[PDB]
Structures are given as C-alpha cells and as structure tokens.
C-alpha cells in the first residue's frame, strides 16, 4: 500500500528543469503529501555507449561494475536504475557527506500512461532550446520524489519570498605531479575548469571565459569565496542559478547563458525586493555577501572537496587501473614509453586497483554535483533561529539550508571518455601556450 | 493510468496453488475488472544456481542468454523477470502454439506492502505440507493477471458447475539414436517419464509407479488417449488434477498424491453430480470419456508435441553445443572417447549451435508445461455451440476451452542440470535391467 501516479495525476506537476539524465517537475497540486516536493524522472538515452553492455543491452550494472561495487551487496542487487541510484546515495554517498545535506528521496510507482502524459507535457513546457532533447523513459515503472530544495519550507512564510541559489562548483583542487607526464605538467598549476573554459571558448560553446575559479570557492578563505560568488553572478553559464519561490530569476539557459547585462542585472535587483531589505540598487551586493557567508559558514564545501580528493591518481594514473580491472591489455602503456609510476600501478594487487577506480568514480560524483542553498528571511518578531546568516548592513537574519543534488553513480566505462576528454583539454591548453 | 494493488486489495485474493517459481491466487472480490481472474506472483529463490550470474547476482538475463536470444530484441531488453516471461510467451511461444490457447496475461503494478500482505496470507492459507516453501518475492513491483482457466466463463452459468481438468503431460516422444551412446540405447525405446518413475520409486518420492504413459497421450490414437486419461485418474501424482468451480476435487498434493482409493473415487463421483447427467456410480466413466474426447478432438497435443520435438539432438547431443556457446572447453568430450557425431557438433558454425540450444530450451518449455481444459455443460434449451463434445451416453453437450499454462523461459545454465539428471536416470535405469 501506498500509491501510483496515473495519467490523471500528470496535471498536478509542472516542468522545473532537466540535465543529461533526468527531467524534474515541481508539484502544483493541492495534496499535502506532495506540496513542496519535486519528481525526478529518468530520460531515455540511446547514443550513450558507457551504459550499454557487450550485447548493447542497457543493464542496471555490468558484470564488471557488479564486481567493482561488490562491497555493498544491496547496491549491486538493485533491480532497476531508480533503486540503484537511490541505494548509491543512501549507502555510498550519505556516509561521506552526511544525512543533513543529502536527501535520497522516496521511490514512487508510476504508470506508463502517467509517463507518456508527462512526455507530452514537458514537450509543451520546455524552453524551445530543449525541445529535441531526450524525453522521459516510458519503460521505467518508478520515479523519485524529493523535497524541493528551491524552497526552505513547503509553503510561503510571512518573513519574505524564498530565494534559493544553485551552484555547480566543479573540481576544487589540483592533482599532484605523481602520475602526470612531463608534457602535461600545467595540470598541477592550472585548474581543469580554467583549461576547459579555453576549449569551450575555441569551440564557441560560451560567449566568453567565465570569471569563476573553483579554487577560490574551495579556498577556505572568506574573501576568495566572495570573489567566486561575484564571478558566478557575472558569468553564470551553467554554474550559477537563482530561484524566487522556485522560479528562475538568474541563470538557467545552459552554459550558453548570457553574461549578466545591465538589463538582466536590473531585473534581478528588483526580484530581490522584500527579500533583502535594502534600498533600490543595493540589494544585489547584500545578496552576494549573504550567499558567500552561507557557503563559507556551512563548511559544506570542505566535506565535498575531501570526496573530490578521492581522485588520488588523476585520470592519467587511474586509467591504468581501469584496464587491469576490465582485464584488458592497457593501450595507454602502448602509446609510448610508460612511466615507472604507471608500471607500479599495474603491479598493484587487484584489490587495490579495484579500490582506486571505485574511489575515482565516487570523486567524479563529487566533482559533478550541485549544491542548492535555500534562504528564508526571519521577521524581527520571530524567536532566535538551525543555521543562519546575520547581515549587519540590513540587520536581517536569514535561516538557510544546504542540499547536495545530482549525486549520480558514474558508469565504469566512462573512465575511457574521461581519459579522452582530459587528453584533449591538456593537448589544447598546451598548444595555446 | 491504470492501477496498483495495495495492502487493502490483499483481502480480495485467495490462495489457489503454486509451483517452483510462482504463487497463484484467485480473485474473490467484487470488481468486474477481476472476477474470474487469477494473479501470478513470483517466489523469491536463492539456492538456484542457474539464475545467478558469475557475480552471484540474479539478473534478468545473463550476457550469454542475451546473446542466445538476440533475435527478439524486445525479449532481451526486458527490464525485469515479469516483462521477460510475458514477452517470451507473446513473442516466442504464441507464434508456435497460437493465440487461441495461450494467454500471456496483463502486468499489474503491486506495492511492497501488497506483496508482504500476500506473503502472510499464503502462509495462513497454504496446505501444511507447503508452509516452508519459498514465498513471494517482495522486491518485485509487478505481477501477472491471467484469466482463471479453471473457469469457462467469469461466473456460473445455469447449465451446471464448471469442471476444469489440468494435465502435466510431460514429453511425448522418444529421441533417435543419432547422438546417443551405445550404453544408453534404452533411451530410444523407453520414455523419459517411465525411466524417471523408476528413480522416483527407488527414492520413495512416489508410493507407486504411475500407470500414465505420455506416449499414449500423444499417440494420435483415441483409444490410447482414453487409456492415458484413465491412468492419470488412477495415479494422479502431480500430472492430473480436477477443479469444481476452481476448487480441487481430485489430485493436487504434489507427486506424493495418493493413488485414487475407493474413498477418493467415491467423493469424486459425487462431485460430478449435476455436471454429468448420469446415475450414481456412472459419472466417472462418462467424465473420463469426455476429457478424452476433448483432448483428442482439440488436436492441441499435436502442436505441443511438435515444439517438444525442437529437442533435435537429445540433451546428450545438445550439451556439446552448450559448451561451444558459453565458450568453454567441453568436459563431456573429456569423459572418454568422443563420438564422431559429437565432434561434428563442435564443428558446427556458431550460428547453428546457438539455434540448436535455443530450440532445446523452447522444447523444454513445451515438455514442462500444463494444459487446463475447462468445461461448461449446455442446457438442452441453448442454441448450437466454438469447440464442444457431445456425450451420447448422457445426450449432453459440453463447450470446452483448452489453455496452456506454465510456459516459462528456461535459464541457459540449466543445460548443465538437465545433462546431470539425464545421466543419473539412464545410469539408474540401465543397472535396474
Ligand atoms: N531536489 C530538488 N529540488 C529542487 N530542484 C531540483 C532538485 N533536483 C534537481 N532540481 C533541479 O532540476 C535540475 C536538473 O536536475 P539534475 O539532478 O541536475 O538532473 P540530471 O540530469 O540528473 N543532472 P546531469 O546529468 O549532471 O545533467 C537541477 O539543475 C535543479 O535546478
Ligand atoms: N491461468 C490460470 N488459471 C487457473 N489456474 C492457474 C493458472 N495458472 C496457474 N494456475 C494454477 O496454479 C498452479 C501453479 O501455477 P504454475 O504456473 O504451474 O506455477 P509455476 O511455479 O510458475 N510452475 P513450475 O515452475 O513448473 O512448478 C497450477 O498448477 C494451476 O493449478
Ligand atoms: Zn597502463
Ligand atoms: Zn563435447
């Protein structure tokens, strides 16, 4: 006993957003069971080689993956992808990031006709830019219900509007030189994000290089955190978005998003009215300081950075462990004269190779996730605040919550794509110098 | 949109029966959507090596199976076992047996709590003998709804009670000598069923050898069909059962079922009252003639026999093709001096080996299935009859329907068990001569 979302329930859900794997819809009906929740629904994807097995079947886990993730029997026994992703979050990620900032959600049964109805709705409600993107996978029979982290609470409080900020921080550290070739040494001093911006700029996938440096955001320095926030505001690309009661008021158009112009900046400043009690023109600066204080105060990025640091070898190192795992002769090692560093990796007992690659894929989850920080203004006539920021410049107090979203299990075969991409980025960056 | 069976729906379903893979419950509620339907629910089984992969995970299909069944992409893409079994019936079996006698059923969503509730119900309602048998697999989220083939129509007609007969016919032919060793030649002249009865009798799994000979039932001769029916009645074991409005009135206690005694025979004769219009003591003979006429008249066994004959090589031959398929050195061939017959099999192109093994597993489906024949007496004031039998001795007309049940996909790894079992049966039978 609980429930199934049917064709008749589709009308209660409205498009919120999407990424490469999922569609997200917000609840818009009346039931107290669902107010302030979102539903996450998996897209259909062929064209993705990493999720296929040797027979071209999209299996929950490949035999190689089952072997890699063997430590959690629960995980490898997942009968479908919805269960797999839920158990990965619950059993692998939550022990690392804690339950306070991670919602694994609740699985709900869905009918085929509910999903076909949603397919049609997202086609109508999508931005034009996304109309040909992959739609819902109507062969799945579960979906995931999660709290809406664009909201602090299910309903509006009298204090003000709920403003929520979403950050895709990317990788906050630089690899050591230990498994990196002499020709690729800039990797130890220039961030992956910065190097990638150069390639995106050459491929005209962005109108200009972002001002954002993840090394600032993860620096441990309040000034540098503020710098990162100001930068994200200026050039949001797909790294920064802001919601007013679950509605986009900054960013959200993919990495193609325009850099904040006077017009965009002006509308945003007015969108903050009431939320920040400051005169016209001054709220933006207060808002950026608030986000900065919440980010720094929460310490949430320190813990994420430690999981990102589970990438101990860099992909240039870990790819060798990958080949050992899948029991193939290593083509990296054929490319030229192998480092002693690399040979020692192949010398590793198979248990250590397994552990290294697993930890690399967990780190990839941490490098690719997002954080949603939701804020609720307090009335001066409320009692004392959980976590909060006090803005002296407006003498306002804001409760806040931080949640990690988009914490997905990365397919083992993606190690190959990760290697190729890294190779291309460093090759490109090197010749641009 | 359709529905989910929830905890509250459990009360509408009552235990009907079970075999090694499934629990079956009949609908007992009021909804016209379900009256005259049964629900088939998969049991949980560990202890079954054939359904595990190389990692001990119970996958929908192994990589080897995906390769074997590659011809139906639909089949190999099944996301779970309920879909797999439904698509196997629809896409593989129905083209061979026809849609008239095969109901693939309809998948229904089920909640975990519905299944946990059913678990508890079947524990209460099971015969004591079956209380420790595997119960429902509560990790599945679908079940199968099928028409109740113990019933001719959803409700009772005024003509009489519905009497339904269920036959597990077993294999109706003898292999050729082509891939059988000289030491095992009795296989070409004595049925697998007869030989197996000897082993069961030694292992005291039956109180006595059955009188039933499948070669009679599949003979094409009306007299021999009648002989088989009379034999099944005498010693039902697990091959013969009879239902009165969905309630057991003969057989049903496993292969351990007692041979029909005077007491059992007397109760059965009274259970037929009204159904067969014949004086006390004479209905049983009329009933057996009726079943015989329906079986022979329908021709249904001719078509089943042709699918059983898809076992072209015998397991003694096909096991060699199995080893080629899974890309292993053949241990059969190591056992002693291989036949030329066997060597030629290993010489086969891989496409022919694949086809042979597939056809063997389809034949295994046909050898292990059951047929349910349901009867409805016609009133003398009804119009002319679909398929029917006229009993002159009572001047009664009976409409009948025949359905194949228990048409399951056999796991590839079971080839190993099939070989071992065959080896044991022929070894035992040989030394008993
Ligand atoms: N719990 C949530 N509450 C509110 N909004 C959410 C939530 N989860 C996701 N979203 C929004 O929906 C968008 C897409 O969700 P996301 O989980 O990133 O999709 P995805 O396809 O699984 N990720 P990716 O594969 O990295 O492109 C996010 O960018 C958020 O704006
Ligand atoms: N459609 C149906 N209508 C009425 N009764 C049925 C139906 N299907 C199954 N049954 C009854 O339920 C019993 C068990 O079903 P069955 O499909 O044989 O279970 P199973 O576990 O999948 N077979 P097996 O693995 O060969 O032991 C049968 O012997 C029938 O008496
Ligand atoms: Zn290598
Ligand atoms: Zn052989």
Q: How many angstroms separate the CA atoms of A247 and A243, rounded?
A: 5
Q: How many angstroms separate the CA atoms of A38 and A27, rounded?
A: 6
Contact (CB, 8 A) for B82 and B42: yes
- Indicate if ligand 2 lies below 6 Å from the C-beta of B166: yes
CB count in 10 Å sphere of residue B204: 8
CA distances to B149, B292, B323, B387 from B268, rounded to whole Å, are 20, 17, 50, 25
Inter-chain CB proximity B80 and A76 less than 8 Å: no
Joined tokens for residue A247: 């509605």
- Indicate if ligand 2 lies below 6 Å from the C-beta of B21: yes
How far does B251 lie from chain A, in Å, by closest CA?
36
Q: How many angstroms separate the CA atoms of A96 and A116, rounded?
A: 37
Best to test chain B binding among A56, A70, A109 (most B CBs inside 10 Å) = A109
Q: How many angstroms separate the CA atoms of B360 and A41, rounded?
A: 41
Distance of CA A211 to the CA centre of its chain: 19
Q: Which residues of A touch B139 (CB under 8 A)?
A: 79
A106-110 and A142-147 beta bridge pairing: antiparallel
Inter-chain CB proximity A63 and B76 less than 8 Å: no
Q: Which residues is A276 bridged to in the sheet?
A: A273
Question: Strand, helix or coil at A377?
Answer: strand
Q: How many angstroms separate the CA atoms of B194 and A161, rounded?
A: 81
C-alpha closest to that of A15 among A155, A124, A146: A124
> If you write DSSP's letter for every residue of B139-180 in order, what string do you get?
T--EEEEEE-TT-SSSS--TT---EEEEE-----S---STT-
Q: What was the elucidation method?
A: X-ray
Q: Give me the residue from B54, B57, B80 closest to A76, CB to CB.
A: B57
CA distances to A116, A378, A394, B264 from A383, rounded to whole Å, are 48, 9, 18, 81
Ligand lying nearest the CA atom of residue B409: 2
Query: Chain B interface residues facing chain A, Cβ-Cβ under 8 Å?
Result: 1-4, 6-8, 53-55, 57-59, 61, 63, 66-67, 70, 76-77, 79-80, 109, 111, 113-114, 117, 139-142
- End-to-end distance of chain B based on CA atoms, in angstroms? 63
Residue partners of B198: CB distance under 8 A and separation at least 6: B209, B428, B429, B432
Q: Give me the residue from B55, B79, B142 closest to A139, CB to CB.
A: B79
Question: Strand, helix or coil at A36?
Answer: coil
Inter-chain CB proximity A76 and B66 less than 8 Å: no
C-alpha closest to that of B149 among B382, B374, B379, B410: B374
Contact (CB, 8 A) for B405 and B371: yes
Q: How many angstroms separate the CA atoms of A131 and B224, rounded?
A: 68
Q: How many angstroms separate the CA atoms of B82 and B143, rounded?
A: 7
A106-110 and A4-5 beta bridge pairing: parallel
CA distances to A178, B69, B333 from B351, rounded to whole Å, are 50, 12, 21
C-alpha closest to that of A321 among A340, A339, A343, A306: A343
B396-405 and B370-377 beta bridge pairing: antiparallel
Q: How many angstroms separate the CA atoms of A336 and A342, rounded?
A: 12
Inter-chain CB proximity B57 and A66 less than 8 Å: yes
Contact (CB, 8 A) for B208 and B258: no
Contact (CB, 8 A) for A186 and A256: no
Q: Give me the residue from A63, A77, A141 closest to B63, CB to CB.
A: A63
Residue partners of B194: CB distance under 8 A and separation at least 6: B213
Joined tokens for residue B237: 């074991």
C-alpha closest to that of B276 among B402, B396, B152: B396
The interaxial angle of helices B300-308 and B350-368, nearest 10 deg, is: 140
Which DSSP symbol is given to B43?
B
CB count in 10 Å sphere of residue A20: 12
Best to test chain B binding among A5, A44, A79, A113 (most B CBs inside 10 Å) = A79
* Resolution of this structure in Å: 2.0
Residue partners of A211: CB distance under 8 A and separation at least 6: A230, A231, A234, A235
**Ligand 1 centroid distance, CA of A405 (Å):** 6
* H or E segment to which residue B133 belongs: none
Which DSSP symbol is given to B92?
I
Residue partners of B282: CB distance under 8 A and separation at least 6: none
Joined tokens for residue B416: 């190993």
Q: How many angstroms separate the CA atoms of A73 and B221, rounded?
A: 56
C-alpha closest to that of B283 among B272, B295, B294: B272
Q: How many angstroms separate the CA atoms of A212 and A230, rounded?
A: 8
Residue partners of B139: CB distance under 8 A and separation at least 6: A79, B44
C-alpha closest to that of B143 among B86, B60, B88, B58: B86
- Alpha-helix residue ranges (DSSP H) falling in B126-271: 192-202, 214-217, 222-234, 262-271
Contact (CB, 8 A) for A190 and A142: no
C-alpha closest to that of B214 among B408, B360, B409, B371: B371
Q: How many angstroms separate the CA atoms of B163 and A138, rounded?
A: 42
Q: How many angstroms separate the CA atoms of B284 and B270, rounded?
A: 9
Q: Which residues is A69 bridged to in the sheet?
A: none
Inter-chain CB proximity B109 and A4 less than 8 Å: yes
Domain boundaries A1-161, corresponding CATH code: 3.30.200.110
Question: Strand, helix or coil at B129?
Answer: helix
Q: Which residues of A touch B109 (CB under 8 A)?
A: 4, 109, 111, 141
A247-250 and A13-18 beta bridge pairing: unpaired
- Alpha-helix residue ranges (DSSP H) falling in A17-174: 63-68, 73-76, 81-88, 94-97, 112-125
CA-based nearest residue in chain B for residue A111: B1
Joined tokens for residue A35: 């107010």
- CB-based burial, B270-289: b 16+ in 10 Å, e otherwise: ebbeebbbbeeeebbebbbb
Rg (CA), chain A: 23
Joined tokens for residue A297: 């105060």
C-alpha closest to that of B136 among B41, B46, B59: B41
Contact (CB, 8 A) for B82 and B140: yes
Inter-chain CB proximity A113 and B1 less than 8 Å: yes
Dihedral sign for Cα A243, A244, A247, A249, please: negative
Q: How many angstroms separate the CA atoms of A284 and A293, rounded?
A: 14
B142-147 and B163-167 beta bridge pairing: unpaired
Q: How many angstroms separate the CA atoms of B13 and B294, rounded?
A: 31
Q: Which long-range contacts (CB under 8 A, 24 or more apart) does A15-22 make?
A: A15/A121, A15/A122, A15/A125, A15/A126, A16/A150, A16/A246, A17/A252, A18/A43, A18/A122, A18/A126, A18/A130, A18/A133, A19/A406, A21/A45, A21/A408
Inter-chain CB proximity B111 and A109 less than 8 Å: yes
Ligand lying nearest the CA atom of residue B334: 4
Task: Tell which one of A13, A15, A17, A122 to mutate to probe ligand 1, the residue whose CB is within 8 A of the most ligand atoms.
Answer: A17
Q: Give me the residue from B4, B8, B55 closest to A4, CB to CB.
A: B4
A163-167 and A240-244 beta bridge pairing: antiparallel
Residue partners of B304: CB distance under 8 A and separation at least 6: B97, B169, B172, B218, B366, B369, B371, B404
Atom of ligand 1 nearest to the CA of A103: 1
B106-110 and B4-5 beta bridge pairing: parallel
CA-based nearest residue in chain B for residue A8: B1
Q: How many angstroms separate the CA atoms of B72 and A274, rounded?
A: 61
Inter-chain CB proximity A2 and B140 less than 8 Å: no
Residue B426 sits at the vertex; the CA angle it makes with B422 and B428, to the nearest 5 degrees, is 115
- End-to-end distance of chain A based on CA atoms, in angstroms? 63
Domain with CATH 3.30.200.110 in chain B: 1-161
Distance of CA A207 to the CA centre of its chain: 22
Task: Tell which one of A16, A170, A238 to mutate to probe ligand 1, the residue whose CB is within 8 A of the most ligand atoms.
Answer: A16
């Amino acid at each position: 006993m609980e429930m199934i979302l049917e064709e008749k329930d589709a009308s209660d859900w409205i498009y919120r957003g999407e990424g490469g794997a999922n569609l997200v819809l917000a609840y818009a009906g009346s039931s107290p069971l669902f107010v302030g929740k979102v539903i996450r629904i998996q897209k259909a994807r062929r064209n993705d080689k990493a999720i296929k097995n040797s027979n071209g079947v999209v299996s929950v886990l490949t035999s190689d993956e089952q072997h890699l993730w063997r430590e959690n029997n629960e995980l490898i026994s997942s009968p479908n992808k919805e269960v797999l992703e839920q158990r990965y979050v619950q059993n692998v990620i939550i022990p690392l990031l804690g339950p306070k900032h991670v919602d694994a959600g609740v699985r709900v049964s869905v009918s085929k006709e509910f999903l076909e109805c949603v397919d049609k709705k997202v086609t109508k409600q999508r931005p034009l830019a996304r109309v040909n993107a992959a739609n819902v996978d109507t062969s799945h029979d579960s979906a995931l219900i999660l709290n809406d982290h664009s909201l602090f609470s299910q309903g509006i409080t009298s204090g003000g509007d709920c403003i929520s900020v979403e950050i895709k921080p990317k990788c906050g550290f630089l690899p050591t030189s230990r498994f990196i070739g002499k020709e690729n040494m800039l990797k130890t001093s220039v961030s992956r994000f910065k190097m990638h911006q150069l390639l995106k700029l050459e491929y005209i996938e962005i109108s200009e290089e972002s001002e954002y440096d993840p090394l600032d955001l993860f620096s441990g320095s309040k000034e540098r955190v503020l710098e990162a926030i100001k930068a994200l505001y200026s050039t949001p690309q797909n790294n920064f978005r802001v919601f007013l009661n679950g509605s986009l008021i900054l960013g959200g158009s993919g990495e193609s998003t325009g850099r904040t112009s006077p017009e965009i900046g002006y509308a945003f400043e007015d969108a903050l009215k009431g939320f920040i009690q400051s005169e016209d023109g001054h709220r933006t600066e207060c808002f950026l300081q608030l986000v900065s204080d919440a980010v720094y105060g929460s310490g949430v990025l320190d813990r994420l950075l430690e999981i990102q640091k589970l990438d101990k070898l860099d992909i240039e190192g870990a790819i060798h462990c990958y080949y050992d795992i899948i029991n193939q002769p290593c083509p990296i090692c054929r490319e030229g004269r192998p480092l002693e560093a690399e040979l020692s990796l192949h010398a590793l007992p198979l248990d250590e190779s397994l552990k290294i690659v697993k930890e690399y894929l967990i780190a990839a989850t941490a490098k690719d996730c997002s954080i949603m920080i939701s804020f609720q203004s307090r009335n001066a006539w409320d009692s004392e605040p959980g976590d909060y920021v006090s803005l002296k410049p407006t003498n306002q107090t804001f409760d806040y919550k931080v949640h990690f979203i988009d914490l997905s299990l990365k397919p083992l075969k993606r190690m190959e794509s990760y290697y190729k991409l890294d190779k291309k980025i460093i090759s490109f960056y090197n010749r641009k110098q």
